[PDB]
Amino acid sequence: GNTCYLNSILQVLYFCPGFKSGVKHLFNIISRKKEALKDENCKEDSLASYELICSLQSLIISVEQLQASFLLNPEKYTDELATQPRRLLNTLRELNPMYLQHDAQEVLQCILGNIQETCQLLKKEEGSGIGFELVEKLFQGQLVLRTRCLECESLTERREDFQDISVPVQEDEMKTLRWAISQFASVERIVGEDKYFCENCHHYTEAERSLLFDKMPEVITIHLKCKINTPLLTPLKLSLEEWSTKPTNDSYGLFAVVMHSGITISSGHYTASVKVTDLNSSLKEYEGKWLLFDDSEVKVTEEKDFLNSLSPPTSTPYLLFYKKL
Amino acid sequence: RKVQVSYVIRDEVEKYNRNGVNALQLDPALNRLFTAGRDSIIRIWSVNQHKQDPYIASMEHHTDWVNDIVLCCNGKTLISASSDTTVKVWNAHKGFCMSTLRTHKDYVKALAYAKDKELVASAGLDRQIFLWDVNTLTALTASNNTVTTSSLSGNKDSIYSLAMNQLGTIIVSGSTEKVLRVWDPRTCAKLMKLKGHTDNVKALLLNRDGTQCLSGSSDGTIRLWSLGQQRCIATYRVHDEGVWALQVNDAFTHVYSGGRDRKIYCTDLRNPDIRVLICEEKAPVLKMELDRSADPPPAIWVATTKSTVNKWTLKGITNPITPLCTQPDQVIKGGASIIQCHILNDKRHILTKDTNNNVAYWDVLKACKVEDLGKVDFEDEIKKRFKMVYVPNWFSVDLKTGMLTITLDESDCFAAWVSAKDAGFSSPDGSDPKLNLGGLLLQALLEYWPRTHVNVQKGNGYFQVPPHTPVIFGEAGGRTLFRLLCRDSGGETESMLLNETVPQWVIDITVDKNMPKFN
Ligand SMILES: COc1ncnc(C2CC2)c1-c1ncc2[nH]cc(Cc3ccc(-c4nc(C(F)(F)F)cn4C)cc3)c2n1
Ligand SMILES: [Zn+2]
């Protein structure tokens, strides 16, 4: 198969907290409506978005079945592991005006947006006839765009939403994640030819365009701009209190990395890796280890081996994921 | 590059400040106070209790905000920094502008002074500090026209404060760089980069011999630094919001501070627990000036964002959080800033609203007020004067000073072509041509310029703007090129400076008398 850019983020989403039970209790409603109309006329555009939830549920059931057998290469047993991503990708391509390899971040945002779309479509038939806040309260947060008139030192505040956090690598050499976060969220100064007109001062003054974090989701997705074969420091623990509106001690931890192999992004291969914690059911053997996904082959590797696979310049990481601790 | 023609709609003499005051200067020997109002007018008042209307004089040669002023030579000369990218030198005794250094690239924010050396320094948003001798500037005319800079460089961001010691041996600059940069004013060499604050610094101070430094930043932290040790020795936290003004006694013992939080404190540097809430003003404090009639200072003058300036006495001879003053001892009342404006559908008249909600009706063409309307509803009065005739936009209104400043840009100055009968100009023969409002106004502003007088007429032939109307030629962005009153166009020096300064798109209409044409 040649659907690595989708399969990587699918494997990442599989281990996201609340995503599993969320899509389960969301597909429950679709099955209820199917059988209720079987006992008892919607738009086809919404119907296409409805169907991918059932497709995702079948996929996740199959992945759970494959996990119970501890089969790490089902290519010789079940072709379904490759046929299901195509079943999802056809519906995805149908749901979009956009476009054998493409962006792994674009497909992530697209899947999340389609799930939010069907969440709204099911909301519009719940109170008119928690559950539908899946994507909104897992990956999407509350960004704040306060700018400060350096003369009167007054703050003007605006609110926005965000799922991904696009971030550069180098400047225009080993940069910590703090520097790369600052490059995206820190201050751009308004001063010179085009100043900022302050209504309070009624005058041209200097300003500071800064970004801030107000209310954070359960999982932070981090996009990494590049191709550049120079990686950066990837810290395990993470806290956003330095760039937060209301400084709170909600820290996060790295649990999923999507890496890119090949210089040309036109036909580069995406590889996935996910850490496993809170395995309450039984498997403490895998607790702390890292699963690596390359094509249909999943492997178990220690934390230090994966951390050395990151650091030196073969496959550079493309997406990072941090869950709340 | 692009030149705009502005003019101020005002009375000939504005006794009171139509905007807030950014700096204060006191003359001890003559009992005179200099207020640098944001309305581009430096006002001299008398500080005597015997005065009931303490107005003395006005100095109105500035264009934009006036941020800092400095007295020199026993009160003979004054130097003012302004947001019009100019530093003006005036006679303090007779209140008239002597020179205008157009050296700064951006706003001029602060001035540092040394009275033992009679030495001044100007700093602003252009990341450059310029040193000047007072006696060199006082001996300047249109003939004696020679004075360049001795600039200090290094600031990686814009400057907001400046200070020098009394002896004039050490200078310090505070920037939005969050770092105090120290230079030697004699040798012009970088001394140290004090790295203590975490926000912009807006007030600095130094002792007599230049051994210790005081700093007031927008983080609420006052800081005392030892110069020889290159370190901050003390950090006081007496304000809730930013610290914007600083004063110190003669012995360099108590610091007088204020800022965004209107509370003003006299805190002992040797023990921060010994601080007294002097008073909480009505508006955030911009600057302060101590009375030095005794080693225990008797009173302090406070200039805030409001137009009025207060004088609070310092007489403790209570205990908890009581403000030392429930009301100021002296009050210099300022005017009211025109806060809102609206242009009618005919693009001929203007409806303005000041701080007291008093609405006024103006004729931007004639450049004069029509009537005062009182505390009427602004939107209801806007909809109450509804004329259906459409006229294009041919100008812009500006309130950077608090008063009406009408600006005309080359692109759309000559866009208005109105009917003479609809314009109110009744010809005896019942004629009605088409008149360009921009051209008529340009000819009215340059009515007293003989170069426009072509054989001979004088004016546009329909109306006359007031002769006191200040006409300005300024570059778009902040640069101010020339300023003069209308009737002052008859002066030979003003005439030559106009011949050099007036742009071509004004010359071809006011002098060449040609048609404006389109685009
Ligand atoms: C999460 O995998 C996916 N999720 C969502 N979609 C997919 C497919 C792209 C549509 C996959 C996907 N991709 C490539 C794969 N190759 C083999 C499999 C089956 C398998 C996977 C994991 C395990 C396992 N789990 C633990 C632990 F620690 F969680 F208990 C330990 N081990 C060894 C056991 C078998 C497979 N599955
Ligand atoms: Zn402001």
Side-chain angles (χ1 to χ4, degrees), chain B residues 314-354:
Chain B
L314 304 174
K315 300 303 159 54
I317 184 62
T318 54
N319 324 95
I321 201 62
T322 59
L324 187 57
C325 302
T326 56
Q327 45 193 174
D329 186 84
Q330 285 193 25
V331 176
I332 296 184
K333 265 301 300 173
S337 303
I338 303 176
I339 64 171
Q340 193 175 342
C341 155
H342 175 73
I343 311 178
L344 281 311
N345 301 21
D346 58 353
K347 311 306 181 306
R348 291 196 55 208
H349 297 81
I350 291 182
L351 209 56
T352 59
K353 179 179 182 178
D354 52 59

XYZ file of all heavy atoms in Angstrom, chain B residues 314-354:
313
model
N 2.785 69.109 50.533
C 3.430 68.028 51.282
C 3.604 68.485 52.727
O 4.689 68.908 53.133
C 4.777 67.642 50.641
C 4.742 67.239 49.166
C 6.151 67.038 48.633
C 3.910 65.982 48.972
N 2.528 68.389 53.509
C 2.516 68.839 54.902
C 2.005 67.704 55.785
O 0.796 67.535 55.962
C 1.670 70.099 55.063
C 2.163 71.271 54.238
C 3.604 71.613 54.576
C 4.260 72.409 53.459
N 3.477 73.622 53.101
N 2.933 66.931 56.341
C 2.617 65.921 57.325
C 2.748 66.378 58.758
O 2.581 65.573 59.680
N 3.044 67.656 58.975
C 3.202 68.200 60.316
C 2.573 69.587 60.391
O 2.392 70.254 59.372
C 4.683 68.250 60.726
C 4.822 68.735 62.171
C 5.470 69.144 59.778
C 4.164 67.825 63.184
N -1.743 60.645 57.576
C -1.882 60.383 59.004
C -1.161 59.099 59.407
O -0.008 59.140 59.836
C -3.361 60.288 59.419
O -4.029 59.321 58.599
C -4.045 61.639 59.267
N -1.839 57.956 59.272
C -1.232 56.695 59.685
C -1.402 55.595 58.636
O -0.399 55.131 58.079
C -1.803 56.232 61.031
C -2.081 57.384 61.975
O -3.202 57.888 62.043
N -1.059 57.808 62.709
N -2.636 55.144 58.322
C -2.769 53.909 57.538
C -2.649 54.129 56.038
O -1.569 54.434 55.524
C -4.171 53.406 57.915
C -4.853 54.572 58.647
C -3.956 55.766 58.514
N -3.762 53.962 55.330
C -3.797 54.089 53.881
C -4.330 55.462 53.457
O -4.698 55.659 52.298
C -4.604 52.942 53.247
C -4.238 52.748 51.770
C -6.107 53.152 53.444
C -2.793 52.362 51.546
N -4.351 56.420 54.374
C -4.933 57.726 54.084
C -4.086 58.475 53.061
O -2.871 58.615 53.252
C -5.051 58.554 55.361
O -3.753 58.716 55.949
C -5.974 57.870 56.355
N -4.676 58.958 51.970
C -3.945 59.870 51.083
C -3.594 61.152 51.822
O -4.423 61.722 52.536
C -4.933 60.123 49.938
C -5.900 58.981 49.999
C -6.014 58.631 51.451
N -2.348 61.600 51.651
C -1.886 62.785 52.368
C -2.696 64.020 51.995
O -2.821 64.948 52.803
C -0.399 63.015 52.095
C 0.286 64.123 52.897
C 0.133 63.875 54.389
C 1.753 64.231 52.515
N -3.263 64.048 50.791
C -4.078 65.164 50.333
C -5.415 64.643 49.832
O -5.458 63.758 48.971
C -3.372 65.949 49.223
S -1.758 66.601 49.683
N -6.504 65.190 50.375
C -7.833 64.882 49.864
C -8.173 65.689 48.619
O -9.056 65.285 47.855
C -8.890 65.136 50.942
O -8.795 66.491 51.399
C -8.690 64.191 52.118
N -7.490 66.810 48.400
C -7.703 67.651 47.231
C -6.477 68.531 47.057
O -5.847 68.907 48.053
C -8.972 68.503 47.387
C -9.118 69.164 48.746
C -10.505 69.735 48.963
O -10.835 70.201 50.054
N -11.329 69.698 47.921
N -6.105 68.866 45.823
C -4.851 69.595 45.603
C -4.918 71.018 46.129
O -5.986 71.623 46.253
C -4.696 69.581 44.079
C -6.092 69.471 43.571
C -6.820 68.606 44.562
N -3.737 71.557 46.439
C -3.672 72.942 46.886
C -3.957 73.899 45.735
O -4.761 74.828 45.877
C -2.313 73.240 47.518
C -2.253 74.626 48.123
O -2.699 74.794 49.277
O -1.780 75.552 47.435
N -3.315 73.694 44.583
C -3.538 74.573 43.440
C -3.947 73.773 42.209
O -3.576 72.609 42.051
C -2.298 75.429 43.138
C -2.101 76.569 44.136
C -1.087 77.596 43.674
O -0.843 77.751 42.477
N -0.490 78.308 44.624
N -4.731 74.406 41.337
C -5.268 73.752 40.146
C -5.153 74.713 38.971
O -5.713 75.814 39.013
C -6.735 73.317 40.324
C -7.268 72.722 39.030
C -6.873 72.320 41.464
N -4.434 74.303 37.929
C -4.393 75.022 36.663
C -5.328 74.275 35.719
O -4.997 73.195 35.220
C -2.972 75.118 36.104
C -2.089 75.948 37.037
C -2.989 75.720 34.709
C -0.685 76.166 36.520
N -6.507 74.844 35.483
C -7.525 74.179 34.684
C -7.181 74.248 33.203
O -6.847 75.316 32.681
C -8.896 74.805 34.937
C -9.721 74.078 35.985
C -9.966 72.631 35.580
C -10.711 72.544 34.255
N -10.817 71.141 33.769
N -7.263 73.100 32.530
C -7.083 73.027 31.099
C -8.416 72.984 30.365
O -9.493 72.957 30.956
N -8.319 72.978 29.040
C -9.490 72.960 28.190
C -10.114 71.583 28.095
O -9.972 70.738 28.980
N -10.824 71.366 26.992
C -11.490 70.101 26.719
C -11.078 69.621 25.336
O -11.134 70.387 24.369
C -13.013 70.243 26.805
N -10.664 68.361 25.248
C -10.205 67.798 23.986
C -11.393 67.389 23.126
O -12.327 66.740 23.609
C -9.298 66.595 24.240
O -8.194 66.951 25.054
N -11.360 67.774 21.851
C -12.366 67.337 20.891
C -12.155 65.852 20.630
O -11.217 65.463 19.925
C -12.292 68.150 19.587
C -12.441 69.644 19.882
C -13.355 67.684 18.605
C -12.296 70.528 18.663
N -13.018 65.013 21.198
C -12.784 63.574 21.157
C -13.418 62.907 19.937
O -12.892 61.903 19.446
C -13.276 62.911 22.456
C -14.791 63.067 22.607
C -12.555 63.499 23.659
C -15.379 62.266 23.748
N -14.532 63.433 19.430
C -15.229 62.787 18.327
C -15.623 63.826 17.288
O -15.839 64.996 17.609
C -16.470 62.026 18.819
C -17.065 61.073 17.793
C -18.209 60.251 18.351
O -18.365 60.128 19.566
N -19.019 59.684 17.464
N -15.723 63.382 16.037
C -16.063 64.265 14.932
C -16.814 63.481 13.868
O -16.649 62.265 13.738
C -14.810 64.910 14.327
S -14.991 65.408 12.603
N -17.646 64.192 13.109
C -18.370 63.595 11.996
C -18.534 64.628 10.891
O -18.884 65.782 11.152
C -19.744 63.070 12.427
C -20.574 62.554 11.293
N -20.309 61.358 10.659
C -21.660 63.074 10.674
C -21.199 61.163 9.702
N -22.030 62.190 9.690
N -18.285 64.202 9.656
C -18.427 65.055 8.483
C -19.799 64.809 7.874
O -20.200 63.656 7.672
C -17.310 64.786 7.460
C -15.946 64.790 8.153
C -17.344 65.825 6.350
C -14.789 64.489 7.228
N -20.520 65.889 7.583
C -21.868 65.772 7.050
C -21.836 65.264 5.609
O -20.778 65.108 4.993
C -22.597 67.114 7.127
C -23.174 67.530 8.485
C -23.992 66.395 9.088
C -22.090 67.995 9.451
N -23.031 65.007 5.070
C -23.143 64.441 3.730
C -22.728 65.422 2.642
O -22.404 64.991 1.530
C -24.575 63.965 3.481
C -25.026 62.922 4.485
O -24.468 62.812 5.577
N -26.041 62.148 4.119
N -22.731 66.721 2.929
C -22.311 67.727 1.963
C -20.807 67.965 1.973
O -20.315 68.749 1.154
C -23.045 69.048 2.221
C -22.822 69.581 3.625
O -22.207 68.870 4.447
O -23.262 70.715 3.909
N -20.074 67.318 2.884
C -18.622 67.477 3.008
C -18.222 68.946 3.129
O -17.119 69.341 2.745
C -17.887 66.816 1.840
C -18.335 65.395 1.547
C -18.265 64.504 2.774
C -18.692 63.082 2.438
N -20.035 63.036 1.796
N -19.127 69.767 3.659
C -18.876 71.183 3.876
C -18.783 71.562 5.343
O -18.013 72.459 5.690
C -19.979 72.029 3.228
C -19.994 72.016 1.712
C -20.848 73.162 1.210
N -20.379 74.430 1.756
C -21.150 75.487 1.968
N -22.446 75.462 1.703
N -20.608 76.595 2.466
N -19.547 70.901 6.207
C -19.595 71.231 7.620
C -19.240 70.011 8.459
O -19.244 68.873 7.979
C -20.976 71.765 8.010
C -21.343 73.041 7.318
N -21.843 73.074 6.034
C -21.273 74.330 7.727
C -22.071 74.327 5.684
N -21.734 75.109 6.693
N -18.931 70.266 9.727
C -18.419 69.249 10.638
C -19.152 69.373 11.967
O -19.463 70.482 12.414
C -16.892 69.393 10.823
C -16.157 69.013 9.535
C -16.395 68.556 11.981
C -14.650 69.080 9.650
N -19.445 68.234 12.592
C -20.080 68.192 13.902
C -19.123 67.513 14.872
O -18.786 66.338 14.692
C -21.416 67.450 13.837
C -22.487 67.878 14.840
C -22.767 69.368 14.719
C -23.758 67.073 14.630
N -18.680 68.251 15.885
C -17.675 67.772 16.822
C -18.257 67.630 18.222
O -19.232 68.291 18.587
C -16.467 68.714 16.867
O -16.894 70.023 17.267
C -15.807 68.795 15.506
N -17.620 66.766 19.010
C -18.012 66.491 20.385
C -16.753 66.381 21.231
O -15.855 65.595 20.909
C -18.836 65.201 20.476
C -19.276 64.825 21.880
C -20.113 63.555 21.860
C -20.597 63.182 23.251
N -21.462 61.970 23.230
N -16.692 67.165 22.303
C -15.521 67.249 23.160
C -15.678 66.311 24.361
O -16.490 65.379 24.338
C -15.301 68.710 23.577
C -16.544 69.344 24.177
O -17.056 68.825 25.192
O -17.005 70.372 23.638
